[PDB]
Structures are given as structure tokens and as C-alpha cells.
Design a binder for this molecule. Structure first.
Ligand code: EFX
Ligand code: CL
Length: 242
């Protein structure tokens, strides 16, 4: 069911980095990873949490639809793309933390906790501040657990409406061409050691879907582009994308 391919490690070592890629072949129900241990080690989800957060906000009516505008609060922050109005689509695209912090405050501890348990999401533990627990609280999730959660979302099997799941999958759209579609979400965890980057999602092909989840050590922001670059090299090696 699970195969370890330590040859993908070359994609990490060649960039003086360390990390794990996990792939799941939906048709064959088989998984692949370069590091079985790290594939099951639990990290802060950071901005990958915007997937479950969006689902909960939509299903409770905190977010009406993907067009609703969340006005900039007028506080200048150091990420320029955050200093503007956003909707669900652009807030996901630019990982606009302060928009999602307000979502969480309106969701509230009790409903957030129940929903993450219903999703079987990670360790389901929201201990910490309700508006930051996915950045510096007690919640943790592994790469294999990300795959399990994403598979439910793909099949509309999460315990929220089909509409909520369709909207979030639209907002996850990252890349599309004549060969594949990628729906995914990046993450960047810096407040608790070890600092890591995430990329989780899936690749839609004509006749199959490949789910993926990767994390990697991220001592500085200089390496953030390696999250996608390393993942795609693995996909290319396995002949999933040209
Ligand atoms: C080039 O990006 C930076 O330098 C930088 C610095 C500080 C923070 C972030 C950030 C914040 C949240 C999510 C992400 C991300 O990618 O998933 C990235 C980006
Ligand atoms: Cl779409």
C-alpha cells in the first residue's frame, strides 16, 4: 500500500534542504514517499489551514460566497498584497492571514473545535488563541493526514455542504493547462520550530488524480519557491506531468 522511494531525497539534498513528499495514486489506492517517518510527523499547518477554515466559514454563513468583499482594516502590514480588499479567491491566493483571523473569531472556539473533529483533521486540537492557533497553537497535522483530508474534500465527503466544498476547491485553483490541473494551498510556518514550508493539494489528469503533500525545512523565506519546484520535479520524475 505504501512504498518508500528514497531516491526523491536527491531533489531535496541538491538544494541543501531536507523534507518529505507524499503522493497518492487515487486509481490504484497506493501511496509513495521519500521518508515514511517524516511523512507521519505532525507540524503546524500554518496557511494550509485556510482550506478547512474556508469550508467552516462558508458552511456557517460567515462567508456568503466567493464574491463577498472583506475590506482591508486599514492597518499597514509588511506584505503589500494584504493591504487591500479581498474576496475568498484572492485571500487564498495571497494567504491573507488577517482575513482568516477574522473568520476564526466569528466562527468561535466551540464551532471550530467540533468542525475539525468532524473533519478528522490532524490532532483536532485548537488550544491557543482562536485567531492564531494554526500559526502558534497546539494544532498539528502530518503530510499523510493532509492527504486523507484532501481526499475527502475531492469526493465531497466532508461533513459540510457540497456547495461549500465546491467553492473551496474553486478557491484552491492554482494552475491549469491542457495537461493537468493543480488545486493546492501553500503554507509557511515560522513561529514554532522547526520552520517549514508546506504545499498540499492534488493534480487532476484526464483519467486519474494524484494527491500530494510536502513539507520542507525553511530556515529563511529565500527558499519558499522550492515548495512548488521540488514537488513538480518529483511529479516529473514519476511521469505524472510532462
Ligand atoms: C516571498 O514571501 C516572503 O518573503 C514572505 C515573508 C513572510 C511571510 C510570508 C507568507 C505568509 C503566509 C503564507 C505564505 C505562503 O507562501 O504560504 C507566505 C511570505
Ligand atoms: Cl474551478
Amino acid at each position: 500500500e505504501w512504498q518508500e522511494n528514497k531516491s526523491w531525497n536527491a531533489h531535496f539534498t541538491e538544494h541543501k534542504s531536507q523534507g518529505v513528499v507524499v503522493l497518492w495514486n487515487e486509481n490504484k489506492q497506493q501511496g509513495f514517499t521519500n521518508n515514511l517517518k517524516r511523512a507521519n510527523q505532525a507540524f503546524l499547518p500554518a496557511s494550509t489551514f485556510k482550506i478547512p477554515n474556508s469550508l467552516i466559514a462558508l458552511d456557517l454563513g460567515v462567508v456568503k460566497d466567493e464574491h463577498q468583499v472583506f475590506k482591508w482594516d486599514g492597518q499597514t502590514r509588511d506584505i503589500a498584497t494584504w493591504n487591500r480588499d479581498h474576496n475568498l479567491i484572492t485571500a487564498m491566493k495571497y494567504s491573507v492571514v488577517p482575513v482568516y483571523q477574522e473568520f476564526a473569531r466569528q466562527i468561535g472556539e466551540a464551532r471550530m473545535s467540533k468542525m475539525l473533529h468532524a473533519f478528522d483533521y490532524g490532532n483536532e486540537d485548537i488550544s491557543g488563541n482562536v485567531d492564531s492557533f494554526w500559526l502558534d497553537g497546539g494544532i498539528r497535522i502530518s503530510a499523510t493526514e493532509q492527504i486523507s483530508f484532501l481526499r475527502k474534500l475531492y469526493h465531497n465527503k466532508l461533513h459540510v455542504s457540497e456547495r461549500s466544498q465546491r467553492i473551496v476547491k474553486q478557491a484552491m485553483l492554482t494552475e491549469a493547462n491542457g495537461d493537468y490541473i493543480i488545486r493546492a494551498k501553500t503554507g509557511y510556518s515560522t513561529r514554532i520550530e522547526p520552520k517549514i514550508g508546506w504545499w498540499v493539494g492534488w493534480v487532476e489528469l484526464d483519467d486519474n488524480v494524484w494527491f500530494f503533500a510536502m513539507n520542507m525545512d525553511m530556515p529563511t523565506s529565500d527558499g519558499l519557491g522550492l515548495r512548488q519546484a521540488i514537488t513538480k520535479e518529483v511529479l516529473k520524475q514519476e511521469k505524472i506531468i510532462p
